[model samples]
Each structure stands twice: as structure tokens, then as C-alpha cells.
Target: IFSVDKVRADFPVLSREVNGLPLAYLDSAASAQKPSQVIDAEAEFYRHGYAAVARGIHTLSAQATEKMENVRKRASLFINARSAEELVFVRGTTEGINLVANSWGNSNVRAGDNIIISQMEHHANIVPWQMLCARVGAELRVIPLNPDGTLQLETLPTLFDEKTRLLAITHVSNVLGTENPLAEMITLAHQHGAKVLVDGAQAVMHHPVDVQALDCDFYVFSGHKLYGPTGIGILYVKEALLQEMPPWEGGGSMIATVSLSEGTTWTKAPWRFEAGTPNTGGIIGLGAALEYVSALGLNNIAEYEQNLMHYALSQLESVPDLTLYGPQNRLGVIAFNLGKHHAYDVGSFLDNYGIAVRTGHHCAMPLMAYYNVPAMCRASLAMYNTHEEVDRLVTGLQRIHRLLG
Candidate 1:
């Protein structure tokens, strides 16, 4: 078993006090805390060596460029992408989705074409397709979830057909924390001749996913959600799909040659999509974050988190009037609502005990509306969280019971 205490020590922010109590952070799904190594690397980049990437030939620029490519290499391997050519860095999942939705969705989708996504998608996955559908006269379809907030795979055959041009889904639900059957979803979409994109923002840091193995057309993730710096993320679109798409944004680095008389030749995919000077610091910091997680063995972290999630469920169930959302086998997250209390109010009440749980629709308003609920309180754990902190959560829920009862 991996030592939780040792892992906890790697994150300095975890040590800070909140309202005179030690911080019991359970909102990792919103954004994770970075390890000391990642923090130091990001700070060191700005302090000692801050250089723009892919534009200059100076030594600092070369170093920055190398580190940026290396981050893509690491992220590519982490997701088991075929090559670095398939990786394109963006601001985060939202940008990644917009890249594909505009680049591929606009160029390829036609009047009768369809884009399919789940009802559990974050607004990042939902809005992009809505825009695409409106622009190209394409149709948007959804695979509905069951009453338990789990996807209904039985309806797959009917929802997907010849008109389905693309399928976008989250590997794990941000609000419910339900793990979708992604591989199967991809396979079904491929059978219908539709490309598939997985929103790995929640799952990349929580579980091991090999994009090639899943045979997804694209995979998108955010840096901050994965314990890295913000304002950076990755989009892995397959080479075949990349070949069909035009540049979503065109600028300096994305052009091969521009002439006044003749047309311009655009760069290849990946670089073709990166319009301007990239977020060099965030990219390098993401590399450091990957190294930090790799040093701890990702598989070991998965096992540890699964154990912790079970422990948390039991602790939460012991509290009266606590209603848990999501499935039983959810790995590292739990979403719930307390009886007769607004989700945000419950969250605010828990804050008195220094327990931080997310209170909102979690960017899945469609999912929340489907269930006839306004919002939820989410407790998402990372590898560094301890059992003692979970105990504190139980005590906080007890306090809630006292106030509400």
C-alpha cells in the first residue's frame, strides 16, 4: 500500500489551516492541489528561466521549446497516444472541445449529420456541439442516464445510427462521479462510422486510460484538474481524423508559407491548431506534475483511492439523512445531498469545520435538470487525503444534523 502520509507531505497547500481547523479538501474534481515539485518547477520557470516557446532560436527558447514538447511526449505516453504529432496543447478541456468542435465539427458536419453526447456532459461538452449543430444544421442527440445517474447503454443502438458524425462524452461524470463505460461507447460509435471524443478532464488523474486501446478519435484533459498548473491542457486527435480537419485558428506558427498571389499552406495537425505563443510555464509545470505522479506509480494511486472512496462512503452512510449520489464502484469521488438542506447551504455549514465540498451543478446543468435537482454537494478525494480528514467530514455532517434536525 502507498503511504498516504508521505504523499500528503508532497503537497504544501494541504497543510494550511482553514478557520482554525486543518483543511479537509474534498473538492479535487474542481481542481486538484499541486505537489511541491510542480509548484517549485512552475515558480522556477518564472524566476530563473521564463522564455517563450517555438518562436526563437535563443538558448532559453530552445530549452523552453524542448520542455514544451517533452510535456506533450509525457502526456501522450500517459494516455498511450500513438505519437506526439497527435498532441495539441490548449487552455483546458473547454478549449480542447472548442478546438475539435470548430475545427472538425464545423468542417466535416453537414445539414443532416449528427453529434451525440451523453446527458451527463459538462457544459464544455454540451455547448460546443450545440454551436456546431446550429451553424451546420447538424442534429445533437443525447444518451440518457438511468435513475441512478448511470448511463443507459441499452438505448445505444437507437441513439446512434448512420447520421451520427461524432460522439463526445466524459469518461467520468463530474457531478455524479459515475464512471461511464467508455471503451464500449467508443466501440459502438466506431461501428456506426462516427468518431468519438472522451472528456478526460475528470478521469485522466483518477484512473489509467489508454486512448489507443479505447480507440477514441480524440481525448481532452485539463492540467489543473490533474495536479498541474492552470491555463494548459492537451487535445489528442488521431492522425487520420487530424488529416480531415482544417485549422480552427490560424496565425504565425500555424502557416507553412503565405504569399500575396498564391494561397497559404497550413502546418500539419497539432501545430496547425496552436495559433499563438503557448503557455510555456503551464506546459512545463504539467510535465513536472506528470513526473510527480509517475514517481508514485499511477496504478498504486488508483488502488489507494479506491480503498479510500469505500471508506468515505461508509463514513458518510453512518450519518443520518445523508443521501449519496453516484454508483457504488466510483473510484475517488462522492456526490451527495443532505436532507432538507440546500446543497450550497450544506457546503457552507461544512465549511465551518474546514471541510471543502463543491456546491453547484458542477457544470452539468442538463444532468441536474434531468434529475429535477438544482445542485449537489460533491466530495472528491485525491491520493493525499487521509482517513482522519474523512473522519472530520463525518463529524461535520453530524453538526449538519444538529442544525437541520
Candidate 2:
């Protein structure tokens, strides 16, 4: 039921040309282009239904509150959380992870305990744990990845022990495009009485996530990466963890009762974490984005994207003197380098051809250090991307090689 051509039409930006050439957007991993459904949903809300949400008796405010909460219900169903109450709204993956780290670390983590992460995690998944470790005198242990970027599962036992408090990992590597085996890892971590936090930023659009099935202690993802508005993200905590963790941020919406003497009572799990004025429009847009993806179907999208990923790997691999990183069974990303050329040079050259790709360490500097490369050019996929666009990218790369080789 999902066709790339039809999906492409929903995204108006795909029809435009860049630099007098058709845009072969290969940067969905950075941020996805908004579809008209998502765009009009937010725009309409602003123009016609705008009002402050919650605690207002005005009819407009009631409408605003319901619109925001409807998205909450939508997201809960999207991720298959037990209830919408378990999902907390935050600014993005960075803010959500930080929220969990501070609230849970302050409450549960103790000195001499350790937190575990992998070598390929983005900075959002890595730095917060490092800061938490520094603040609480806990040790930070990283699971080593193989040269091809897959985790070394054999080493899990060595890092885990009675003192391990948390295992934080990315569900998918933004740079490597490798999807980690979360269910096995989550089960393993739980066997040791350690909680697991999944940075689900890269996995949501590419795969259907069921939080109850994964049994992860915490999960976080950004809406912008899912064709929704920026500055909005969702954080899912298991009910047990949510009950125990305190609210890290303080403001109007989160408080149940505040007194002058400072013995303030906070509200429930999800709302307690959302401290200030909510992004009502962003939330509504996110709801539309979720429903859009829903109608197309996640399973269908996943299969199509995987098939396209394989085609991309084959075409990109056939190029002369180009080295492809990551495993063959990666999700929807291609990372590579051309005959010792720098990533910026390749990316810049592609840009001249109206081809957009990500070029940098990709905020995972540790992985770059592990690979002994300064940077890699990454082309990530989304549902709307076409085989023709992949062919265009391959031709562009061949052109770059001809000029620079």
C-alpha cells in the first residue's frame, strides 16, 4: 500500500529544485522534510484555533488542551505504551535523556555504581550519562563495538555486575545505520537488576516500536526526525521507573500545589515532567505525522526502506575505490569514503549537484576515533526517497570520483 512516488507527493519540498537541479535529499537522518498534512495541521491550529492550554475556562483554551492531549493519546498508541500517562513531553531527545538522567540519577543511582553505554552512541546518549557519573561518583563503562560497528556482545558480561545501575544504548546508530539487538540486550540488562534507557531517535520512523515488548526502562525520540515539528520530543518511562523518578524541571503545569514555605506537591508522572507551556501546535503536528505514517503502515515502510537500503548498498559498493562502513544488514543509512578524500570535499562536491548528505563526525566522535577516520559522508533514507534518487546519488558519486580521482 506504500508507494515511494505517492509518499513523495505528500512532501512538497521534494518537488522543488536546488541549484537548478532536482534535489536528491539524502539527509533524513539530520531532519526529515515536513509533509503537507503535518504542515497544514500546525498552520491551521495557529491561525484559527490558537489559545493557551490547560487551566483556562475559555472555550478556545479547552480546545487547545484537548488538541494537545489527543496527541498524547496518539503517541501512546503509536509506541504501544500501556497508557498515555507513561509518556512525557520534552524539547527533544537531548532534553528528554537529560530529564531522565537527572531525575533518575538523583533518586536511584549512587556512588561506586556504574552506567553502561556503547561505543557508537550519539552524544545525546553519551554525555548525559557522563555528567550523571561525574555528579554521582559513578563509573561509566562503554560496550565496545567491532570494527564494522556492531557491538561485541561477548563483552557484556565483563561490563555488567551487581553495581551496574543503568545500561543506556541507541536503538539505531545514526552514523553506522546499524540497528542494535535491543530485546536481547534489554533482557540481559534486566537479569542483572540494571535498568535500560534506549535512545530511540533513529529507530522510530524506520521501525514500529512497542515499549511494552521492548521492556526498556526509558525511551526517547525527537519529533523533527519523524516529519513532525522541531522542539518537541517524547520520553517513555516504564511505570515503575516513572513512579520512582522525580520531576527534574519545575514550572506552572507540573505542580500540584505550591506554597510560600517551599513544600510544593507535584502532579503525576507524564505531566510532572512537562514543566512549562507545552508546544500545542508541535504536539498537534506530531499527532498528524503519526497518523500519516500509520496509514502508510510501519511494517510496509520498514520492508520498503530495507529493500531500498540494500539497493543503495549494492550501487554505492560497486563504485571504484569507495569504502562502505557498517554491516550489510544495516537499516537505512550508507556511510562511506572515496579513495582517501576528505568527507567535506565529497559532501561539498555532492552539494554542487543538488545532492544533500551529512558530512562530519556526526556527533559521535568516539566512533570516529575508533574507526581512525576524521569523518564519513552519510546518506540516510526515509520512506519518500526513491530508487531514482538513489541512482542519482550513485551517478553523482561517480562524477565526484572522476573529478577528484
Candidate 3:
């Protein structure tokens, strides 16, 4: 799969030992392991060009401001955004959604409006909308999913109505790895004249996002899950929409004039939303990560990850006690149970062998409750993940099964 061994070497963290044994990290859906290049980029920013951006026409400040603000351009390129001003940097996906809900949701969404979401959203996607709905009198509607964790397309018609103001959907399920059909969803939302917001935290790593092609109103994703540093993510708004919406937070650089004589005139789109000092280095690193992803080719990453997932799914299926979750075409990730074992216990046992995975509801407590599962073990794949690492996970699970039995 495109010489994953060669790919693995670039991520220096993957070479180290977690225990006496080598690390088998598979929790990329939560946070991807950084390559040496990304890590060094972050460190280098702190070393040489560390200063506040967008202030002082001086050389250091100018260079820093240019480097820092340039990430918005990179982020726009990363998502195929309509304009660079559409990309707003926040701490992560949680902040991105909050920005949308508080800024656009509070403004455009009126009382008795409807906000559509799927049953598969993570808590970040769900909570912000809930809070906003409560603030305004908006109704929260859920599109039902199939038992196998795939979304049911038939259910979409019933969920739409005249009151539907926003359609907030996750591009992929973090817990189950079911890639949602975005092009279809976007078209459906457009027919009803409802705005669409895509949570791309899980989807960006697996699928290529063309914001213009999808024709969604907005998109959001965290950098950490995309192999960049944490505390940074991007919110891409449509050019027209961002210009119409009021700023979520108003202070610092966003203002045209804070006058006693007249009210402030805010910058359009992005700068209107971003307030105060940002995570300068984090944004720079995110640009580097986006560049890295582009260099590797998004198609190549998708293809490599697909093969990795296939190998992992096959390996887990051969294990007698393994009970897999999600759809057959589940992306490069698997959620499964090891017989009657608690997901945490199984995860812990595997950790002893330096094999890592996510265990719990995966921030989808509603989905877990719906499935009647207390918790499930999630092993997500990345472009650099190898067949050998999948074997280690398979072997570790077997040992856990035998020990418990």
C-alpha cells in the first residue's frame, strides 16, 4: 500500500516503544500521531519567529503575522473553500461548532425553527446546537440510522420541513466509521433552503473535502486529528453567509472603530469572528500539516487507508470471539467487542502489549444508548499504519480473549 514502511519512518513517534514492545497506535480518529516534520515545524516556530501577529508594521511582527495568518489561506486550500476569509481558526472542532452556533445560529435562526442532525453526531456536534436551540426556540430533529451504523437515506424526507433552518451532520462517524453521503445530503438540504454544516473531524482524514463541490453552507475540522497539533482547528463558512452573520466575540482586531460617537464597524467574515490573541504556533503547524497532506495526495491517503482498514477488518473477523460493529464499507476503522469483556478492560489488556485503541462511547453516548452497548473498542487507521501493526492488534486481542476465557 504505497510503501507504508517508508511512510512510517517519517513519523518518528511511531518508532518509539510504548512498553518493552513497539507501539501499535490506532486511535487516529481521536488524535493522529504527528510526523517528525509537523513536530519540528511547531518547535521551529517557537525557536525563530515567535511573536504576536497582525500588529506593528515592524519586520518580526510582519513576518510572524504573515506566517500565522497565511494558515487561513492553507486551510482554505485544504478544504477547497470559496475564499480564504471563509476559514476561521479555533481551538478544535468543539470551538468551531460553538462559533457557528453562537455567531450564525443565534443570528439567522429564529424562534420555532428546526435544526436537523443525525443520530451519529459526537457530543461536540450535538451540544452546541442543543444550547443554541434552547436559547432560541429551535427544534432539534434527528435523522435515524440503520442498525449496522450506516445512515438511512429513506428517513431524510421525514426529517425535512419548512421550519428546517440548519442541517448539522457529521461526515463520518468517529465511533463506527460510517462515511455519510455528503453530496446527496447537501442537495437535499438545498431543496428545502436549509443551511448545512458538516463536522469533518473524522471525515477529513479519510475523504477529500471540496467545499464548493459538496455545496454545503459550511464545514469544520480539528487539526490534531489531521496529524497537526491540538488546540487548533478550522471553520469554513460560505463567503456570503459569513458576511451576513454578526461576530460571536467582539474585541481587539475585529473592530474598525470603537467610537463613543458611533457603533463599531466589524471586519467581514473571518476576522469578524476571531477575537484576541490566537494560538499562533498551532495555526502555523496546522498549515504545515495541511501542506503535508496535500504533498502525500489526498487520494493516495484515502486509498492507503482503505487497504489498511480492509486488512484490519479481515484480521479481526478471523478472531473467534470478536464481534464487529458498523457497516461493511466502514472506513479505515473498526468498533468491536471481545466476547463479554468490558471495552475498557480489553483496551487496558491490549495496552500492556503497547497496542493502543479508543474505548468508551467515543463521545457518542446517544448512539451507544441506542445500540444497547455499554462501550466498544475503536481502532482507527491512518495512511502510515501498516499490515504488521494490524497483526499486533489481532494477536493482542487473541491473548486478551484467551486470558479472560
Candidate 4:
């Protein structure tokens, strides 16, 4: 049985009041609030299991190394990777994407070849590709979006050509919350002999991803966006791609043999990608987050959030002259705007009632440009969120429309 009350209890910050009113946090798409279990797990690692892994032969090192390996195995299962050998520890999604761009992209992408991205990509997904294209004198192709903030699939085929080297895209839009049809696109890319890398920071919390099933060359996500600690993230490279790609960073532990004259021999994938000391505490907390979410069940969360989405969309329609961006079936986020009202003003007004929302370009300037809006007000949902909170959000928006309309 699923009790939202019990789930809410695991998050202490949810109980705190802001401006003398309960904090109606509606920004899970940006980053989720950490549960006490994750917090305690991180703290306990520092208390007992903290050590530099794979260096010392002492008990602490052995214990920490074992814990790290266990989490890696679980994460591999979390994404349904072929094995833990495919999972590399990136600092976060940005670094992971950049690493792929530099390591894999540098090796494969050449001058005159083009890389494909979408109109709704976050800055993390956009800039890295731009950097790689500029460096290699390659072109960057973009898939256009419809007015509803969903990708235009007809444009996808046009964007791919014989010179297409890669398709770097986000699984879900951070701004408009549209989940792209990746399976079909991945197949298309493969048909054209191109690779695909999915930025899953926004999708990991709401959907269960199977990298093997997706058959994408790479998948990446930040742990902080999934109710875990920051400073740690996941990068899943397909075994074939891992074998072909060279190491992005070089340092201790990644090298199998070092020599001044003969040159250095590198370790295998995953470890070769992880160069420095691992974030042991962050990794432990990520394990806790995985356990917590797995116990709660992602399918249950998906159903619960969809019901909440229906309620939110219905209530949002009650406001006059209000415009909602994206499709009604979007996951976890609703981006909208009030007529002639600046997004910052709407956000400030919502804050007056202790309702936290994201308002701005949301790191997707191209998406905002497509809507022709300077900014947007975004209210995102999470597993522990309640219908009451949705009511509060609607009430706050209604107030803004009435007072400023």
C-alpha cells in the first residue's frame, strides 16, 4: 500500500513553514528535496565507512570499496544496464555529457560531420555539443518543436543525414516537461550509423529506464535531481561504446601502468572514466535514495503523479487568459504564463503565499524562443506531493490572475 503521508514524513523540510505558511515546494524538476533516509545514509558513511577506496588495505578501505561496488551494482540495475562495468561515476549530468562530448565525441566526430540536438534541450545538453562542433569544425542540427512544446518528428528525419555523427538529447524537457519519443529516434540514429546520448536528469525520477532496452550508446543523469545528494551522478555507456571510447580524465587509479618512456596503460571502462577519488558519501546517499524509491515503487509514483497532473491541468484551465505550454500528458512539470504578466512577477506573487515555483527560461532558451515568451512559470510534481499542494498552487495562480489580470 502507498501512503503519501508516510512518504512526506521522510522529508523533514516539507514540514517546515515558509513566511509563516507551509512550504508548497513545486520545483522538483530543478532538484528534489532529500529524504531523511538519504541524509542519514550520507552522514553514517562519514561516521563509520568513510575512507579512500582501493588505496589502503585497511578495513575502512575494504568496507568503503565494498559499499561503492554494491551501489554501482544497484545503479546498474536501477537503469537496467548490462552490468556495473558500463556505469561510470560522473560529477553530475553536465560533466557526464561534456565527458562524452570530449572523450567519445572527440574520437568519433570529425570535421564536416554534424551532431543533432533538439529545440528543448537544457543548456547542459546544448553547450557541450556546440563546443564539440566548433572544435571539430562540424555542424549542429536541431530538431524543431511544435507549439505545444513537443518535438516535431517530421523534422527529425530531415535533421539526420549521412554525415550525422550523434544525437545528443534530453529524455524529458526541463522547461516544458515533454518526454521525447526516444525509442524511435534511437532506431533512426542507428539506421543512419550515428550514436545517441540521452540526458536523463529529468526523466530518471519519473520513469524507469532500461539502457539495454533503449539501445542508446550512452545515458546520463544527476543524483541530486533524483532525491539524492549532489556532487555525484551516473553515466551509463554501452559496453561496445565503452570499449571503443578512450578515457576522458587521467589520474591515479585509472592507470594500469605508468611510465615516462613507454607511456601509461589505462584501466577498463567505468574506472577509466572515474579518475580521482570517488565521492563515497554521495554514492552511499544515492544508494539510500535508490532503495527508498524502489521500496516506494516508481510505477506507483508515475500513476500518482499522473492523477495529480490531471487535477492540476483542470484547475489551471479555470483561470482566464492563462496560457499553458507543453502537452497535457507531460511528466512532472507544467509551464505556463498569465496574460501580459511578467514571469518574475507571477513567481514573486506565488512566493508571497509560500509557494515555491520555477520561473525563468529554465535553462532552455530555445524553448522559450519557440513559445515567444520571455519567461515561464513552472510548477513541477514529485512522488510525495499532494493534491492539497496542487490546490494551493492553483489558488495562488488564480489570485495572480484576478489581481493583475
Candidate 5:
């Protein structure tokens, strides 16, 4: 029922050519290519039905509001969040993290409080905390990663103490593709009386996510990275926490009442957090994309991708002088470097052969520092990527390495 070739056919960009060779998009970790179904959904929404939400009694506005809220319902089910009321829409994961940092963090964290993050965190997770800690005079702690890019689980408890207020960490590393033991980590954080916020950007697209089971205080991810439209993301907060946190931003749609003389009153969670005009089309597009992936089944995608990861590792390992980073049990990404060659050079060479791989610190400069590397070339996989394409990447890399020799 689940065919890789048939799935690849759904993505129109996969058929294109670049530099006289077939395209090999290995940058899904950065942002995934949209399927034609998502594309058509967005296009159709703009062409036929487009209107602002929560402001009007007009038919178009009502229809648009219904469609957008339906997306909230779908997304709530996608992550198994407590309810749709807990999911707040924002402009991707960055904004979602910032929203929590400014809103919940400002209220909860004080001068001596501690917020823990890992060395492998993306800038989106790190910088916001840095800024928040600086603003509130709170102390920021970190969980160290091992040489192989896996977390040093033994050190986690050592970092938590009476002052620990929160632990904001990644569910999966974007660069290393290391899947952290989140259930264990969450339990550990809770035992220390600290709330946990998980950056689910990399994890959601690769496998199923159950926030209720994970029991984290917060979870966030971007739609664009999940084969959906950009500029739309979800922040899943525990209903109790949502009820307690104040709105970080205030505007038209988020308020229950406002007056110049009497100040203002705000609505409940979700709407209280989502202000102004919403990205209605992006939400609809994301809903369709989630449905598309759901129909295909996350378990099926995980099974296929596990085999693909093993094959990719085997083929790439055969290349001499290539060093792969991260743990062996990784899901969808491989970061590696060739001997005496800069990642930029290898990435450029691969691109000439129409192989698209990401080359840089991957927004995890601290992670690069921990690994003792300036940068590395990253090749990430998705459900639509084929084994033949992985073979092509290996062949092309071999050709380039030999040419360099």
C-alpha cells in the first residue's frame, strides 16, 4: 500500500533536473519540499476562498475561520495534544519558542532560577533562552553530549537542583540526528520540579509524536519542515500552563474587550496567544499535508526510512576517509566530513552533480564547538527519497573524492 516511487510522484519538484543531472534533495532537515497536494490546496484556497478569520459575519470569513480551526483540530490530533485549545499558531518554531520564553518564562523564572538546555540545541532554542535569562537574571545550565553526539545521560541529574525551573531541549538533533531519550529526560526534569519544553521540529516529520504520552509542558514544531507551508507552526502547551501564562503579544483577534479608558481584557489560551491576522492559507495547506502523511501512516514511513538510513550509512561508509558523526541509531540524517576537505567544498562538488546536501553549522554552532568541527556536510532523508537517489549520492561523492585525489 505504501510505495516509495508512488510517494515520490506526489512531489512535483522531485522530477526536476539541476546542473544536467537529476535532483537529489537531501536537505529535508532544513525544509522539506511540498507535495503537489499541499501546493494545490494552498493555491485553491487563495484562488477561490480567502478571508481574515474571527472578525466578520461574512460568508468568506466564516468559511475561512472554519477551515483554519479544522486545521487546529487536525494538528491537535497529529501530536495527540490534550485539546485544540492548547495549540497556539505562530510563525514557525522560532516564534513559538520565543513566545513561551517571553510569556511563560517571564512569569515563572526569577533571578536565581535555572533553565537547562543541551549543547546540541538549535539557535532557535538557545538564543531565546539566553535572551530571556539575561533579561530575568536567571542562570542557564546545559546537559553535555558525548563524543559520539549522544547525550551524557549520567550528567543530566547532576545539573538539576532546587533552582531548576525548566529544561528546554530538542527532541531530535537537526545536525546529528540523535534521538534523545525524551520520556526519560522528561521524567527526570519533572522529578526535579522543572517543566520541560521540547523542540519537536525534527522529530514530528520523521515519526509519530504523542505529547500526552511524552507529558512535556510544551512542544513546538514548524509546518514547513513537515512538508507543509512555511509561516505556520504549532506550540502545544499543557492546558494548565496555558491558563496560567499571560499573552506575550496583544492585538485585534486575541482580545475579548478593549477600551482606551479601561485598558483591555484578553480571551483564553490559544487565541490569547495568536494575535492579528492569521495565515489562513498556510494553516489549510499544513492540514492537508498532515492528512497526506497520516493517510500514508507514520509507522510505514518510519519503517521505510529506517531501511533507507541503514542503506545510506552502508553506502557512505564504503567511501574512504569519510567520517560520519552522531549515534548509529539515528533516524533521518547523517552528518559527515571528508578528509582534508572543507564541508563547503564537498557540498559544492556534490551540488555540481545535482546532489543537494546542507553544509554549515546547521544553526547549531555550539554543537559544532562540542564536536570540534568548523562545519559538516549533512544529508537528510524524507519519505519520498529513494534508495537509487542515495546510491547516486554515494557514487557522486566517490567520483568527486577520486577527482580530488
Candidate 6:
């Protein structure tokens, strides 16, 4: 049985109160609240299983290395990557994108070459490419979005040419809740001889991901967004690409040998990228988080959240002078504005009612500019969110409008 209440029970913070009311955390897109399983796993690691990895041969060190490697395998399975070696641990999505930008991109892209990304991408995806393009004298192109908050898929063909080297895109928009058509887009890009990299920070949590099925050259995501601890993330590169791209950073663990008289050489794919001591405990916690979500089943969670999103749309529409953004078929995110009121003001009003929602450009200033809005109030849902909470959010907005009037 896929009981939401059973899922909710595992997250301790969900039971807490705010300002004489239960906390309604609608900002999961920013960062998800941790379940007890993840929290306990991290704590238990420090208590009973703490040691440095890779460099030591003691029993504790071996146990720690095994746990860390287990996480790599678990993450590989979670995303259906080619193998554990294809996955490289990183600090977060930002670092993952930058790693590719510095390593693979700098080596492959050149002057007059081009890289394309969508208008709705988060700054993390946009900036790294900008930096890379600027460094290598490559041109950066943008795939425009339709007024309905969907990408203009037809426009993609016109943008590609022999000079196009890569296409980096987001799988899901954090602000608009738009799930991009990645499979079709990847195929189009590949036909033009441009490799594709997907930022899966938002998409991985909402649905299952198969890197092979998507056929993307690289996929990156943050562990925190997937209900794991912050400061840990994964970058999945095609095994062949790994062998081609040089290591981005240099230091202890990544090297095969080092000497004053002789030059250094990096190890194989996975170890070649991880340059120093890793967050071993956080990786263990992430493994537990992946297990927790898998046990609940992603299909079950997706179905539940889709219903919640539709209910939210209908209920939020009833609020006077409120206008919503994005396409009809979206994931569990709603961006809206009430009359001419500022988004921060609406968000502050909702906070008094114990409702937590995100407001601002959502690190997607280009998307906000496309809609001609300065900011929006975004209510992002997860598996633990309830239809009743959606009702409360709608009612709270109604009360705010009435009070303001």
C-alpha cells in the first residue's frame, strides 16, 4: 500500500509547528526536508563507522571505503547509469556542471564553436557554459521557450550547425514545473553531432531516470534535492567520454603516480575525478535516502503528486486576481502572482499562516524575463505534501486578498 501518511511519518520535521500552526513546507524545490532514515544513517555513520577512505588499510578504513563505494553503486542503479565507474561524486550540481565545463568542454570546444542551452535553465546550468564559452572563445546560443512555459522544440533544428559542439539543458524547470522533452531533444542534438548534458537536479526526484535511454553524454544532480544530504552529488558521464576528458582538478586521490623527477598520471574514470578526501558519511546517508525512496516506489509517488498538482491548480485558480504560469501538464510546482502585488509580499502573508513557499526569480532570471515578471510565488510539492495542505494554501491566499482589500 502506498500510504502518504506512512511516508510522512518518516520525516520528523513535518510534524513540527510554526507560529501556532503546523508547518506547511511548500519549498521542497529549494531543499527537501530530511527523513529520519537519512538523518539516522548519517549519525550512525559517525558513531560506529568513521574512518578515512582509500589511503588506509585498517579494518575501519576498509569498512568506510566499502560503504562509500556501495553508495556509488546505489546511485548508479538509481539513475540506471552504465556502471559505477560512470558515476563521479561531487560537491553538488554546480560543481558537476563546472567540472564538465572545465574538463570536457574546454578540451572539445574551440573558437567559433557553439554551445546551446535553454532559456529556462537554472543559473547553475547557464553560468558554467557561459564561463566555458568565454574562456574558449566559443559562442553560446539559447533555445527559446514558448509563452506556455514550454521549450520551442521546433526551433532546435534551426539553431544547430557544424559549429555546435554541445547542448546543455535542464530536464525540469524549478520555477515553472515544466518537464522538458529530453529524449526528443537529445536525439535532435545528436543528429547535429552535438553532445548533450542534462541537469537532472529537479527531474530525478519527480521520475525515474535512465541515462542510457536518454542517451545523454552527461547527467548531473544534487543529492539534497533527492532527499539526501547537502554537499554530495553525482555526475554521470558516458564511460567513453570519461576516458576522453581529462581530470578537472588535481590532488591526492586522483593520481596514479607522482614524483619530482617524473610527471604525474591520473587513475581511471571515477577515481581520476575525485581529487581529495570525500564526504564518506554523506555518501552513506545518500545511499540510505535512495533506499528510502526506492522502497516507496517512484511510480507511486509520481502518480500521487500529479493528482496533488491538478488539485492545486484548480484550487489556486479560485483565488481572485491570481494568475498562474506554465503549461497544463506540469510536475508538482505552481508559480503565480496575485493582482499587482509583489511576490515577496504574498509570500510574507502566506508565512503568517504557517505556509512556506518560494518567491523570487528562482535562479531563473531569463525565464522570469520571458514572462515579463519580476518575481513569482512558487509552491513546489513532493511525495509528502497533501491535498489538504494545498487547500490551506488556497484558503490562505484568499484570506490575504480579502484582508488586503
| Backbone clashes, each candidate | 0, 0, 0, 0, 0, 0
Per-residue error (Å), model 2, residue 159: 0.2
lDDT of 6 by residue, 154-260 (tens): 88767899999999999988988899989988998898889999999998888889999999999999999888899999999999999888988999999999987
Q: Residue-wise lDDT of candidate 5 within 95-144, one digit each (tens)?
A: 99999999999999999999999999999999999999999999999999
List the pairs of residues colliding in candidate 6: none
- Tell me which residue pairs clash in candidate 5: none
Candidate 6 lDDT trough over 10 residues, lowest sum: 308-317
Candidate 1 lDDT by residue in tens digits, 211-255: 888999989999998899999999999988887789988788899
| Number of clashes found in candidate 2 | 0
Error of 3 at 288 (Å): 0.9
TM-score of each: 0.97, 0.98, 0.97, 0.98, 0.99, 0.98
Q: What are the lDDT figures for the candidates, one per model?
A: 0.88, 0.91, 0.87, 0.91, 0.92, 0.91
The TM-score measured for candidate 4 stands at 0.98
Pairs clashing within candidate 4: none
Clashes of 1: 0
Query: Which 10 consecutive residues of model 1 have the lowest summed lDDT?
Result: 324-333
Model 5 scores a C-alpha lDDT of: 0.92
Q: Model 3, 1-405: lDDT tens per residue?
A: 366787788898887788798898988888998888888898998998888887758888889888877788878887888688888888999999998999889888899889999898999999999999999988999987789998878988888988899999998889888889899988989899999999988888776889999998988899999989989999888888888888888798887778878877887667888898888989888888988888888898888888888878877876777888889898867999999999999999888899889999899998888788989999988898888889999988888888898
